[PDB]
Amino acid sequence: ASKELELITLTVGFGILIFSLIVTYCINAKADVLFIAPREPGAVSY
């Protein structure tokens, strides 16, 4: 009984991680498209 539940939870846990990994990954790229190379004069500092 406990094992069955553990497995179900594990699957849902691994599934959630994969979803997040894909989300964070997409963001990492969307950020690299801006902070590509060092900023040059004129750019707006944070």
Q: Where are the domains of the chain?
A: 1-46
> 17-46 burial by CB neighbour count: b if 16+ within 10 A, else e?
eeeeeeeeeeeeeeeeeeeeeeeeeeeeee
Cα maximum dimension of the chain: 64
Residue 2: alpha-carbon gap to chain centroid: 31
Residue 30: alpha-carbon gap to chain centroid: 11
Q: Is the torsion defined by CA of 26, 29, 31, 33 positive or negative?
A: negative
Residue for token digits 């179900």? Answer: 8
Please tell me what DSSP assigns to residue 1.
Answer: -
SS (H, E, C) 2-32: HHHHHHHHHHHHHHHHHHHHHHHHHHHHHHH
Give the side-chain half-sphere CA count within 13 A for 41.
Answer: 0
Please tell me what DSSP assigns to residue 42.
Answer: T
Between CA 39 and CA 44 the distance in angstroms is: 9
Q: How was this structure determined?
A: NMR
